[PDB]
Design a protein around this ligand. Structure first.
Ligand SMILES: Nc1nc2c(ncn2[C@@H]2O[C@H](COP(=O)(O)OP(=O)(O)O)[C@@H](O)[C@H]2O)c(=O)[nH]1
Ligand SMILES: *S(=O)(=O)c1ccc(S(=O)(=O)Nc2cc(F)cc(OC)c2)c2c1OCCO2
Ligand SMILES: [Ca+2]
Ligand SMILES: [Ca+2]
Ligand SMILES: [Ca+2]
Length: 170
């Protein structure tokens, strides 16, 4: 009677595509204006490897600055999509901070976690090399996936593959 509930948290610096990825996954729409300061949760039934489950997505927005609240939000998460934009090197640099924030709270270096390089449809504006992102993912023992919220490339993959990590590790 009770479905598995996979609790996913989007993290990453501003403008990288957290909301656009979420809204593409949820509603099959590329949304380009979503309030940068708006954090919201989303829930959908999805059939994961043939099992009906519920995904809950917390689309964070960095507005909450009070560390105890931010940590409470992370503590509740079971898996993390750590998003940067391949067109903004500083957003890639910033991923280290989210990683540490998550590790401090979850206290488990194997927490379900994907490094997501979004905006793969903007190859001509790339600032982060595939090599260096892959190297960082290797250092963290996480998978690296490049996505485009615009074209839908690997959007279902990152949510499904994270749910597979949650299923396996919890
Ligand atoms: N070209 C392109 N633009 C994107 C992609 N994902 C997000 N954007 C754009 O980047 C801006 C910020 O995206 P948003 O999801 O609001 O970033 P957030 O601050 O991480 O939630 C928006 O104007 C989006 O249209 C993508 O995959 N490709
Ligand atoms: S709450 O459900 O009232 C809530 C959720 C999310 C945010 S936020 O994403 O704007 N701030 C966060 C939340 C995180 F889990 C992590 C952050 O750093 C990655 C930032 C939020 C609230 O309520 C208060 C305002 O912010
Ligand atoms: Ca769960
Ligand atoms: Ca957003
Ligand atoms: Ca869909």
């Amino acid at each position: 009677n009770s479905l598995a509930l996979h609790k996913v948290i989007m993290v990453g610096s501003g403008g990288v595509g957290k909301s656009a990825l979420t809204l593409q996954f949820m509603y099959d729409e590329f949304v380009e204006d979503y309030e940068p300061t708006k954090a919201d949760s989303y829930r959908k039934k999805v059939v994961l490897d043939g099992e009906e489950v519920q995904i809950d997505i917390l689309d964070t927005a960095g507005q909450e600055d009070y560390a105890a609240i931010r940590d409470n939000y992370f503590r509740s998460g079971e898996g993390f999509l750590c998003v940067f934009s391949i067109t903004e090197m500083e957003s890639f640099a910033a991923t280290a901070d989210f990683r540490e924030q998550i590790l401090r709270v979850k206290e488990d270096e194997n927490v379900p976690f994907l490094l997501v390089g979004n905006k793969s449809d903007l190859e001509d504006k790339r600032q982060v090399s595939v090599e260096e992102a892959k190297n960082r993912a290797e250092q963290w023992n996480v998978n690296y996936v490049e996505t485009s919220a615009k074209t839908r490339a690997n959007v279902d993959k990152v949510f499904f593959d994270l749910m597979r990590e949650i299923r396996a590790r919890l």
